[PDB]
Amino acid sequence: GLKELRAVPKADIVSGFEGAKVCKDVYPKGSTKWPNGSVITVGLYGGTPYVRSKVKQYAQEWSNYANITFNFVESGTPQIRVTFTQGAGSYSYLGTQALSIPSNEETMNFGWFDDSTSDTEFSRTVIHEFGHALGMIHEHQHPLTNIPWDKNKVYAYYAGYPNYWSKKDVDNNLFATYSTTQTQYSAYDTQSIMHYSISSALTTNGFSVGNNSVLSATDKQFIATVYPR
Ligand SMILES: [Zn+2]
Numbered sequence: 001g002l003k004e005l006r007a008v009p010k011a012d013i014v015s016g017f018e019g020a021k022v023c024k025d026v027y028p029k030g031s032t033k034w035p036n037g038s039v040i041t042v043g044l045y046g047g048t049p050y051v052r053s054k055v056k057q058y059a060q061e062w063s064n065y066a067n068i069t070f071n072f073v074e075s076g077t078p079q080i081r082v083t084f085t086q087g088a089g090s091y092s093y094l095g096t097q098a099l100s101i102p103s104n105e106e107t108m109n110f111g112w113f114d115d116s117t118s119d120t121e122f123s124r125t126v127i128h129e130f131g132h133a134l135g136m137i138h139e140h141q142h143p144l145t146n147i148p149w150d151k152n153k154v155y156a157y158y159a160g161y162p163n164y165w166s167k168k169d170v171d172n173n174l175f176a177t178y179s180t181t182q183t184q185y186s187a188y189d190t191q192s193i194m195h196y197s198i199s200s201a202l203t204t205n206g207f208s209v210g211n212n213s214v215l216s217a218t219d220k221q222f223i224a225t226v227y228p229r
Pocket residue numbers: 023024128129132138196
């Protein structure tokens with residue numbers, strides 16, 4: 001199979017955020033569009049056969065609309081390298097930033113899948129992370145109220161693997177970024193698979209915001225414009 005990746009220190013994975021389904025922005029230590037028509041190699045590291053089959057299943061949905069294909073392989077150094085490290089959050093580098101990640105590290109992680117995971121949850125989270133793998137950013141419609149973060153909790157969550165974000169890192173990279181609307185679309189698309197989920201595990205009111213679980217009309221149109229036939 002694939003050569004194993006360097007080990008995650010499971011002590012750096014922060015405990016006590018059970019059922020926190022957070023997409024983490026991640027940045028390489030230091031254009032993201034793939035060449036059009038690319039066939040991108042993907043390797044899966046760990047996970048059960050069931051979980052790995054679901055990832056394949058939903059990732060490849062993007063190719064219905066984009067002129068990009070994912071070739072799931074078990075040899076060499078795949079271009080996208082997917083782990084299943086529990087509790088680390090889910091994430092992907094953006095687009096061709098994957099190609100900047102050392103070969104012994106992952107480029108994508110799914111932090112909460114198991115063999116009881118719903119089809120909708122696989123669809124939502126897999127398509128979403130693969131959206132970032134194609135270069136899409138979060139859609140975030142900033143609410144009029146502002147977000148009621150439990151700042152203590154937010155600091156604790158983002159302090160560990162993979163970000164290792166200090167308090168100032170969190171204030172600049174998280175609160176600042178998500179204090180205003182963020183979009184890649186002309187009109188906002190409440191339906192986008194790329195919407196940024198705000199977990200109630202990180203807020204104070206029980207406030208949460210969720211993700212749509214399938215590709216929107218706008219998602220389908222945008223990605224075909226980026227990667228046309
Ligand atoms: Zn995301």
